[PDB]
Design a protein around this ligand. Structure first.
Ligand SMILES: *[C@@H]1O[C@H](CO)[C@@H](O[C@@H]2O[C@H](CO)[C@@H](O[C@@H]3O[C@H](CO)[C@@H](O)[C@H](O)[C@@H]3O)[C@H](O)[C@H]2NC(C)=O)[C@H](O)[C@H]1NC(C)=O
Ligand SMILES: *[C@@H]1O[C@H](CO)[C@@H](O[C@@H]2O[C@H](CO)[C@@H](O[C@@H]3O[C@H](CO)[C@@H](O)[C@H](O)[C@@H]3O)[C@H](O)[C@H]2NC(C)=O)[C@H](O)[C@H]1NC(C)=O
Ligand SMILES: *[C@@H]1O[C@H](CO)[C@@H](O[C@@H]2O[C@H](CO)[C@@H](O[C@@H]3O[C@H](CO)[C@@H](O)[C@H](O)[C@@H]3O)[C@H](O)[C@H]2NC(C)=O)[C@H](O)[C@H]1NC(C)=O
Ligand SMILES: *[C@@H]1O[C@H](CO)[C@@H](O[C@@H]2O[C@H](CO)[C@@H](O[C@@H]3O[C@H](CO)[C@@H](O)[C@H](O)[C@@H]3O)[C@H](O)[C@H]2NC(C)=O)[C@H](O)[C@H]1NC(C)=O
Ligand SMILES: *[C@@H]1O[C@H](CO)[C@@H](O[C@@H]2O[C@H](CO)[C@@H](O[C@@H]3O[C@H](CO)[C@@H](O)[C@H](O)[C@@H]3O)[C@H](O)[C@H]2NC(C)=O)[C@H](O)[C@H]1NC(C)=O
Ligand SMILES: *[C@@H]1O[C@H](CO)[C@@H](O[C@@H]2O[C@H](CO)[C@@H](O)[C@H](O)[C@H]2NC(C)=O)[C@H](O)[C@H]1NC(C)=O
Lengths: 278, 216, 218, 278, 277
């Protein structure tokens, strides 16, 4: 009897594990809410099916410690966004860009708020504090804008240079904008660096900025007991029934081993290198 | 055979209000697949049957979102969020487990109306009809609700049977009434063999039966 | 989409044998299970038989006493339903449909009306319904017309050449035991209009080229 | 899509318990023809009967063949209960060259071929077995049909013979039909096998004057008969499915299938050819 | 060999100007159905209509559908000219759930759904347009068909209604057919679209007492009409050919071809098949 399974299904089984197809959106742009990611709103999954053919559909961004945020989102298992009112003073809100247009209408990340200087040429110190008086942990996603020239920095937020400072009771992250021209991406040379902060129940979070703040419009509910994961595969989702899934397809077998793919999720046999004897 | 017992039989519902029709079978319609093989059909007035809910609760193609189904085993239910004039007709539930399909009795969906009362009239045969050798006495029930009504003929106060045939109009488009006509066909011989003629009517709006008579 | 077309209406005297057609356009009958459901007028739906994909055999409902005969012509993509030993209760609409329990689709046909009554084309006989003397204390007049003994359907009944339309109730016809239809058509008018207005019903029966009028007087 | 059209290239041995008949159909497995020893004591939810199976013993036929085949499969086990039968004077353990096991003339290991004694004596046998147990018994017996009148007297002295098995409410009596029949496995004679179910508290009587293929015992009949049989040449693999067809197993959440009319278990309802979407 | 039997697996976008309708056929592109905005202002020598097209708005039927399809294709462009229509009292911009544009109940962006006012009044609309320009105008208008008598009164007050459009030498009137019909895209009613061509110097009159799917303007009709339409699922490639079929383009010097009857442009004669020259 052969002990190594070598044949996988040509599809991913949506049963019994609850799968969610990110389609054009990876899990990061889904949390940011880039154009075309609105279908993931309120979704819950046991496995997030991320596609390798995913595309960026907004401002050119980069995430310091990208894999950690990607892991926190997938390990949560849901996109439950709670909108909050942030009393930003004087500054302009709802900044939009041509590199992030929905139906040729300049827009932005629907979960973020691009703050800009007022028409009176004023960007005062913004000091906002949110208290987590609930029974769940909050996840705040905020960004820092990096303009191209010293002219752009003053034309958008007046103050030069800017500063972004998000702090809790036991931590503090402070970033200074890195003004400089970068390669052209999606029609613009500027970049936005996104960060995240987790606020436990009973903790506080303080947004303190003098410019370049990509303000959050709320927070995501962090599951009390987080599970689920993510699989970056191009295999389509079929109609089979299996609790084993790989980046090359699902597996329906009783054999204890398999030489298909290391990337296995769920009730899957242990991966072996190659070969099969008895 | 599996027996389908739909309830209720007549479902008067006000437009813009919900409704519910329960379909109860006599055997478990749950295959090992977990797929409850039961469908919901709607036969619109003067129309071929059409499908609304398939496989228990899955909405059929092009069906408005107001329709919805639920249930499992031997108890199922069809629901409409906001009934409208486009939803009038009689609904039937099938049975897909056994290919010997057994439908239900069907639930008619009328529009709710004030109870009101039936206006009863009687029409003696014409002298021109008796010239040919036949006498037909027509009884008229005008503008009543609901549809259910009892019409009894009495010749010389003796109850008749098998010699009458009644017909009812569709629900009116403005006041949602029904109208019923009952004709009593007699030969010219038996018509002159008696004189007392009556047509008794029993209806929900009537506290006591109403009788209209003539003597010739 | 699949289109089911049924043959035209059929009238056969009692004891004969009908043969209803059902042509499928949009899908081969070789890949479709056909069924048949009749509905007696004023009643409900009744399953007659059909084809079961499993067991692979046309199953006929035994309640029809084997009178049903289901034959299929794969070349023309047409299903034939032959009901023998016609009786007075076999009158109604007969549908052909690819029911859901057998095929993933669920389409129906327009229906083939089968009238079992034995007669030929006959013009109607109109007799006025005199103003009801039992309308006492009613304050409203009740009058009408009796269209009796005609075949086949339909007859169009207007009042005063279509001028009178308010309070008009044209009752559906009934199929008498003789094989001829009969309906009543009544109107409600004010009681004072009894001696001030003349009412005449206009009956038209195209199958016999009959267009008779009738005066309705007290 | 609502019609599943793809089946697995193998029969899943899980979770349903499958038993491979291999060279034996379920009938020779009950008689105990050569090669049918691997089924002794087997229990199955689905008996897999191979079309390539062949007859490996005496040429025989079964009046009402499909009923016995259905009874053997619906039971779901091969639990023989051997019994001692006090046959008088007559020879026992008849063997045939058309039933060679290990190049040795043998016979059905569940049947006993009774022949006349060396003293040319085949006396009347009237044995009775009482079912004083808590389960229904299934006795399988046969009647031999020789080729000539000489063969009849050479084997059983009496001509014609007679086989009569009777219970409290039934009786089946057979007179041998003699006649040279087409050559099958080197033999023109044939055997007609029959069966009789004895309820607990009932009795069975084997009465013969010749041509009796006597049973060596009986099979246990389960109180609950829930198993079935599937005749297919598809091999048994290692997949996981509760649906099986004569063309292979199916793993799907779809409500219909256009693969095979023959389906067993948790299977979608079969539809005719073709398949569309919603 | 004198019979070309090998076609290309794609449609050549050169030299002829091709326009892919994609999810929209040429009719929903003219009506301005959802997802058809990519055709606004497009010009084509061959309109590539996809068989896998889908109706994205209200369920509709068009009498003489093939003729109007030929008129739009033969014209060769979608040049819409918006006109102000002074509709009195009645409601405008009617939207339907069967025509969701980005999960928002919308309607044909070239049509205006007129409804009765909140004061329960649908006055007789008698508007007229004069074609003072030098280009013939193509007006597309519809007639709504409700399902019940209650729906007709709830929408247009007047039961029954009437839709009448007339020019100098024409007058077309439609009476709404009321009846429950098969459920299509969550709707039992239908809309019947019509069209009217107005020559320079001619006038057009829209006269309705109800059930009017009013046009928001008109399309420019080219003086010369030289374009066409091709209904095929073959994708558009990068080859160079002046011959196109529903099975693909053809690049050959042979005088005959046995590939497809449906050929447009500089194409060899479609012979009745053939094994040899
Ligand atoms: C920004 O807004 C926050 C929230 O209102 C405030 O920060 C806090 O400011 C107080 C002084 O006003 C700092 O001292 C604290 O005072 C409270 C009240 O007397 C006292 O209970 C504490 O023990 C402490 O002494 C406090 O540290 C500070 N909290 C921070 C910075 O997290 C203030 O309105 C603004 N703060 C700044 C730095 O802009
Ligand atoms: C994963 O494991 C499978 C088997 O579980 C490997 O399949 C291999 O497939 C090749 C096909 O060419 C087999 O080659 C054959 O080898 C036999 C040896 O006697 C030879 O007689 C044949 O002519 C043919 O060359 C190979 O045996 C088979 N490996 C086994 C059965 O262990 C597969 O290569 C493994 N790796 C991957 C990446 O799939
Ligand atoms: C073969 O052996 C069996 C078992 O010994 C015999 O069965 C039994 O035979 C006796 C004698 O014929 C039966 O007795 C009879 O009982 C009935 C009442 O039931 C009575 O009316 C008769 O006068 C007689 O006494 C006995 O019932 C029967 N066993 C059963 C369970 O019914 C059988 O007869 C033997 N056959 C031959 C051919 O020897
Ligand atoms: C059972 O259902 C399946 C699924 O609908 C049916 O499959 C159909 O198979 C035909 C085979 O000719 C497909 O047509 C062509 O297939 C080729 C494959 O190379 C493809 O390149 C073409 O584009 C075209 O699709 C067809 O697409 C496929 N599906 C449908 C909906 O027809 C199968 O035929 C059914 N079995 C029976 C016995 O009816
Ligand atoms: C809808 O509005 C248009 C606006 O042009 C009306 O069309 C034209 O209206 C004028 C009004 O003076 C009509 O002129 C009249 O013509 C008759 C016959 O030649 C003449 O005897 C009068 O003295 C007056 O000059 C003109 O005929 C008419 N053109 C048409 C009808 O084609 C139209 O009448 C309006 N329709 C409604 C229903 O309101
Ligand atoms: C068009 O003509 C060509 C040329 O004869 C045909 O091609 C032949 O097709 C058959 C069928 O597969 C092959 O066996 C031959 O080898 C092909 N070549 C020749 C020279 O015969 C083609 O079939 C024709 N197409 C149609 C639709 O008739």
């Amino acid at each position: 009897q052969e002990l190594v399974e070598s044949q996988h299904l040509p599809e991913l089984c949506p049963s019994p594990l609850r799968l969610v197809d990110g389609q054009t959106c990876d899990i990061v742009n889904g949390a940011l809410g880039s154009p075309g990611c609105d279908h993931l709103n309120g979704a819950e999954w046991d496995i997030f099916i991320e596609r390798p053919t995913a595309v960026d559909t907004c401002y050119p961004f980069d995430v310091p410690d990208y894999q950690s945020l990607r892991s926190i989102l997938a390990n949560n298992g849901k996109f439950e966004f709670i909108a909050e009112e942030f009393q930003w003073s004087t500054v302009k809100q709802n900044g939009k860009s041509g590199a992030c247009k929905r139906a040729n209408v300049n827009d932005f990340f629907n979960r973020l708020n691009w703050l800009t200087k007022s028409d009176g040429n004023a960007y005062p110190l913004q000091n906002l504090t949110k208290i987590n008086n609930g029974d769940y942990a909050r996840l705040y996603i905020w960004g820092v804008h990096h303009p191209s020239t010293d002219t752009e920095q003053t034309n958008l937020y007046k103050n030069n240079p800017g500063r972004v400072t998000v702090s809790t009771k036991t931590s503090q992250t402070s970033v200074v904008p890195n003004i400089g021209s970068r390669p052209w991406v999606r029609g613009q040379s500027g970049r936005i660096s996104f960060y995240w902060t987790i606020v436990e129940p009973g903790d506080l979070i303080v947004f303190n900025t003098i410019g370049n703040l990509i303000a959050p419009r709320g927070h995501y509910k962090l599951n009390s007991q987080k599970k689920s994961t993510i699989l970056n595969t191009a295999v389509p989702i079929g109609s089979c029934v299996s609790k084993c899934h790989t980046d090359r397809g699902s597996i329906t077998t009783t054999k204890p081993f398999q030489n298909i793919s290391r990337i296995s999720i769920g009730d899957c046999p242990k991966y072996v290198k190659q070969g099969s004897l008895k | 055979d599996i027996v389908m017992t739909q309830s209720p039989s007549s479902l008067p519902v006000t437009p813009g209000e919900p409704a519910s029709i329960s379909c109860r079978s006599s055997q478990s319609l749950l295959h090992s697949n977990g797929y409850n093989y039961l469908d919901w059909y709607l036969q619109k007035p003067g129309q071929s049957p059409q499908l609304l809910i398939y496989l228990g609760s899955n909405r059929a193609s092009g069906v408005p979102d107001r329709f919805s189904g639920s249930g499992s085993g031997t108890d199922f239910t069809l629901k409409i969020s906001r009934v409208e004039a486009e939803d009038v007709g009689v609904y039937y539930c099938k049975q897909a487990l056994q290919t010997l399909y057994t439908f239900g009795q069907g639930t008619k969906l009328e529009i709710k109306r004030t109870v009101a009362a039936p206006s009863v009239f009687i029409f003696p045969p014409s002298d021109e009809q008796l010239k040919s050798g036949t006498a037909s006495v027509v009884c008229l029930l005008n503008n009543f609700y609901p549809r259910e009504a009892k019409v009894q003929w009495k010749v010389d106060n003796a109850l008749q049977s098998g010699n009458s045939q009644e017909s009812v109009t569709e629900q009116d488009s403005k006041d949602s009434t029904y109208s019923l006509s009952s004709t009593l066909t007699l030969s010219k011989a038996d018509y002159e063999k008696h004189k007392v003629y009556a047509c008794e009517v029993t209806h929900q709006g009537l506290s006591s039966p109403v009788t209209k008579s003539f003597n010739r | 989409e699949v289109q089911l077309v049924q043959s035209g209406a059929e009238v056969k005297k009692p004891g004969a044998s009908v043969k209803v057609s059902c042509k499928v356009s949009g899908y081969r009958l070789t890949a479709l299970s056909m069924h048949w459901v009749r509905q007696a007028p004023g009643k409900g739906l009744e399953w007659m038989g059909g084809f079961d994909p499993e067991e692979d055999e046309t199953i006929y409902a035994q309640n029809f006493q084997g009178r049903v005969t289901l034959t299929e012509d794969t070349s023309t993509d047409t299903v034939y339903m032959e009901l023998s030993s016609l009786r007075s209760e076999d009158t109604g609409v007969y549908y052909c449909a690819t029911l859901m329990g057998a095929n993933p689709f669920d389409y129906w046909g327009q229906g083939t009306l089968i009238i079992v009554s034995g007669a030929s084309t006959k013009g109607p006989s109109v007799f006025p319904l005199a103003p009801s003397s039992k309308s006492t204390s009613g304050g409203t007049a009740a009058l009408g017309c009796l269209v009796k003994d005609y075949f086949p359907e339909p007859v169009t009944v207007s009042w005063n050449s279509g001028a009178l339309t308010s309070g008009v109730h044209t009752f559906p016809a009934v199929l008498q035991s003789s094989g001829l239809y009969s309906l009543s058509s009544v109107v409600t008018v004010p009681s004072s209009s009894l001696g001030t207005q003349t009412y005449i019903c206009n009956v038209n029966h195209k199958p016999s080229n009959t267009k008779v009028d009738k005066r309705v007087e007290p």
